[PDB]
Design a binder for these strands. Structure first.
Lengths: 71, 71
DNA sequence: TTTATCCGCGATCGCGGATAA
DNA sequence: TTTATCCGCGATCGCGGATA
């Protein structure tokens, strides 16, 4: 768990968490009630993703976030 | 620095950091080059706010984020 | 099976700009 | 001075759905 500085970095880290637990986009989507396509857009093109989508996906991954010093 | 679970909670936490440092929306917006209106929409209505905006505002605040376990 | 891409649709974004208050 | 709100604009969202 490290500091995250961009949407791309964020999406890559969460995608890795998804893969490391062997979850599919479809099963995560079903779990929180959004489209599989929405998870695919977030993983690939996270820049315009809504905060609401990010939080729903975070919950699906059994994750949360905290703020920290940029340093 | 607490676990954050929603856009509102995130926006409230970041607004608080802005105020605790005595920073105005205008000076943050000018610092990273976005609209003052954009920071205002984020603070009040964060749900559909983009990941790009959220990250720009974090940088303006000298903040970063980290993922963690949801518990 | 898994993931990425496309349609139309209604909604909202963030922009420049100008207010409102 | 500070922050919230509105306009028009082009872009993109996330939706149900159906492909690639």
């Amino acid at each position: 768990f490290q500091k995250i500085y961009s949407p791309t970095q964020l999406a890559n880290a969460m995608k890795l968490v998804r893969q490391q637990n062997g979850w599919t986009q479809s099963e995560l989507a079903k779990k929180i009630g959004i489209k599989q396509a929405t998870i695919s857009n977030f993983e690939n093109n996270p820049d315009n993703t809504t905060l609401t989508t990010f939080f729903k996906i975070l919950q699906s991954l059994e994750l949360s976030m905290t703020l920290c010093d940029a340093k």
